[PDB]
Amino acid sequence: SPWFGMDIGGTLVKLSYFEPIDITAEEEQEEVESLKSIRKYLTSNVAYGSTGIRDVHLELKDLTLFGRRGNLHFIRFPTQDLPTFIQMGRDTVLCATGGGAYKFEKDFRTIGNLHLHKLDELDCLVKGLLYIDSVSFNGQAECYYFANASEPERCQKMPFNLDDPYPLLVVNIGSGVSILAVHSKDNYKRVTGTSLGGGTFLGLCSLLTGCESFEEALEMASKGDSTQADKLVRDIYGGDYERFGLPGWAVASSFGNMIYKEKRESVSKEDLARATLVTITNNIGSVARMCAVNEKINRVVFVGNFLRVNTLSMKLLAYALDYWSKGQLKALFLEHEGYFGAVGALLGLPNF
Amino acid sequence: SPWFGMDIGGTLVKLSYFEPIDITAEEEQEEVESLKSIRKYLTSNVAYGSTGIRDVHLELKDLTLFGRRGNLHFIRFPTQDLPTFIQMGRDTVLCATGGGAYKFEKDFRTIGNLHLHKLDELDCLVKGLLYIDSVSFNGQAECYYFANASEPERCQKMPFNLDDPYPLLVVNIGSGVSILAVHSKDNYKRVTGTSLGGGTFLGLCSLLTGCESFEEALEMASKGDSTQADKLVRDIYGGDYERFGLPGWAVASSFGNMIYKEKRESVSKEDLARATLVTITNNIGSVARMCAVNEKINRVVFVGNFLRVNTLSMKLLAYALDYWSKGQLKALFLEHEGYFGAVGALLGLPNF
Ligand SMILES: Nc1ncnc2c1ncn2[C@@H]1O[C@H](COP(=O)(O)OP(=O)(O)NP(=O)(O)O)[C@@H](O)[C@H]1O
Ligand SMILES: Nc1ncnc2c1ncn2[C@@H]1O[C@H](COP(=O)(O)OP(=O)(O)NP(=O)(O)O)[C@@H](O)[C@H]1O
Ligand SMILES: CCS(=O)(=O)Nc1cccc(CC(=O)N2CCN(c3ccc(Cl)nn3)CC2)c1
Ligand SMILES: CCS(=O)(=O)Nc1cccc(CC(=O)N2CCN(c3ccc(Cl)nn3)CC2)c1
Ligand SMILES: [Mg+2]
Ligand SMILES: [Mg+2]
DSSP states (O other), X not given: OOEEEEEXXXXXXXXXXXEEOOOOHHHHHHSOHHHHHHHHHHHHOSEETTTEXXXXXXXXXXXXETTEEEEEEEEEEEGXXXXXXXXXXXXXXXXXXXXXXXXXXXXXXXXXXXXXXXXOHXXXXXXXXXXXXXXXXXXXXXXXXXXXXXXXXXXXXXEEOOXXXXXXXXXXXXXXXXXEEEOSSSOEEEEEEESOSHXXXXXXXXXXXXXXXXXXHHHHHHTXXXXXXXXXXXXXXXXXXXXXXXXXXXXXXXXXXXXXXXXXXXXXXXXXXXXXHHHHHHHHHHHHHHHHHHHTOOEEEEESSTTTTOHXXXXXXXXXXXXXXXXXOEEEEETTGGGHHXXXXXXXXXXX | OOEEEEXXXXXXXXXXXXXXXXXXXXXXXXXXXXXXXXXXXXXXXXXXXXXXXXXXXXOEEEEEETTEEEEEEEEEEEGGGHHXXXXXXXXXXXXXXXXXXXXXXXXXXXXXXXXXXXXXXXXXXHHHHHHHHHHOBTTBOSEEEEETTTSTTTOEEEEEOOSSOOSEEEEEESSSEEEEEEOSSSOEXXXXXXXXXXXXXXXXXXXXXXXXXXXXXXXXXXXXXXXXXXXXXXXXXXXXXXXXXXXXXXEEETTGGGGSHHHHHHOOHHHHHHHHHHHHHHHHHHHHHHHHHHHTOOEEEEESSTTTTOXXXXXXXXXXXXXXXXXXXXXXXETTGGGHHHXXXXXXXXXX
16 A cells, blocks of 8 residues: 555645655565555656646655655645545545545545545644654755744845754744744644635735636736835825834834725735735744744744745745844744645555 | 914824814904804815814814813814915914924925914823713713624624723724723833825725725625635635634634635625735724734724724624623724824823
């Protein structure tokens, strides 16, 4: 049976596959032809169907897992296309997490003799994050931060060490946002959550700009000016609100300038895309800072796929968390953002 | 000179006017004709120009202020129409607060011999809130709450006593949101703020629904179904996420269902109006709960004009704060929501 780990989220399905590389000549013969077909199909292709993609750059090579050496692959496709994935399988023990592990449980059982073990989203995320950081990113650091995020000419990506990870605040930005407090390998809790996450950015941007992909929305946002839609502190005061340390550039009312008809007619759809990204990202950073202060944790790590190929939100989170906390909080990022739940699910395989 | 108090916000100008009713026959003669014209104009009309409105139902009658008896009037008009207000005046000591007191300072000085004293937004709000509650709403309670907000058949407006107000968390929902911690009459601080406030609701609703007024947006929202645009917990899990006490009706991703083109074509503009209101209101309630727990305050009072003639957001805030805090936090409301800054400004008159 192939070694899979699956995280079926509200938007994307994340799959981690361990490809054995220490296969003996005897094991090759005893290998069923289906096992050879799936290993070939997954390793000989980087695009599966019309919506499946293998993130080759994230592959962990020559990893010792469950006593065998192999390569850890990372694959994603939209949850909307899961019925196609299941239909291909109908023509194995599967450890699955995320909300879709429960919603689509009966659908997975349509595969004959398939064993489905539902694992919790929290346990898989924590165990997956701690594991990937422990085995490193092919010798490189899994965790990184943006040094000197306050100054753009110095803002550069730099590695960060998590050999003593606790305490840790995990901000999972998926369709929504989940915030976890990790005090030990077995002591972690979900602090809170907010429904304004990646789905809000993509949903609002589609309504406002007509964008047809997450990548197209980011490209629109890169060419836009969010101040054309947002009302700033200087729009209300004429300058900085120094009594409470609020600079003039700070946003006072997101989309606040859109109450005037003349500015709705002048705003570009690139501006609305940027304003949507800024609004969602700033609110997540503010909520993350509030939970960090209440939980008394100074390291805040951001995961989920809202931040993939999304450097603007990362830089925005890095600058915001450093400025507003006056340097006491650290925004941290991980190379394998959206796959930790799938890895944690795969790590539950020996328990069955 | 007339006794005015003005709060020039980013969206609305709030004006409090004390009309003397104990005027003697000698004072009437010594009264200049301009003083008689303005008192007549403000008391003989409920609509000033095309955008000014006097909230007659909020008037405080037979109030003893500064040693004289009189009526306290409450008037509002859009900040966009302030140049008209100033032009009418050009053809008096004015205590003004809000961001517009600084932005439009030079404009007020165009009125000959006018004395403009800028007062801070925080001091006027706290002093205005505590004053109106102390003198009551014509014998009735200024503060009220929604009892049994968990059960709709029992949810009813009930008075609330604030004779010992401290501690108190004030959530000022204007264009943005400001959150204040009030520990005493002279010990209060701005905890934090979020740019997702009333301006975000009105701005986004105008972009999505083409609404042309705050009242029209609320009427659209009353006829809509926010679940047509929001992705719920049951949309991701198929039911309740009982591991973390999340019911199936809870929103997992605001506007999250709008990532699918088929649902963007099926959603009504009434649904988008409701989803905008719910998204903004729920996020404010969640932020208010987080600040209340960190500040260790159990009474959260909501002010600003985002909640005027807006019972849905009030009921939403009342239900959310009671449910998610498991009954430990209380959502409180005040009859004179958006005028406390203007009252506090007027109360600074003896200091000049
Ligand atoms: N190719 C993509 N398609 C859709 N969304 C993408 C894509 N790439 C990045 N994203 C962003 O990543 C977010 C989803 O991230 P993800 O962590 O996978 O959430 P999820 O697990 O599927 N939902 P949830 O059940 O709440 O965890 C989307 O809302 C987008 O903002
Ligand atoms: N007639 C109205 N016109 C516009 N907005 C209204 C109106 N009535 C209620 N509102 C709502 O009330 C919000 C403004 O409330 P308000 O407390 O007066 O803010 P403000 O003080 O002018 N802005 P700020 O400078 O940030 O305090 C608007 O964003 C609307 O959501
Ligand atoms: C990965 C879990 S998921 O699959 O269910 N998706 C998901 C993603 C983000 C948020 C949520 C919902 C959530 O966490 N809530 C707790 C905090 N809330 C509030 C709201 C108002 C108030 Cl006054 N107080 N608290 C709103 C409800 C779900
Ligand atoms: C009445 C005062 S006003 O006139 O200036 N209007 C106004 C209304 C609401 C909010 C604001 C701005 C504000 O309070 N901020 C502090 C908290 N923020 C963040 C953002 C990200 C992070 Cl990581 N941490 N903190 C954002 C900035 C202004
Ligand atoms: Mg997820
Ligand atoms: Mg205001």
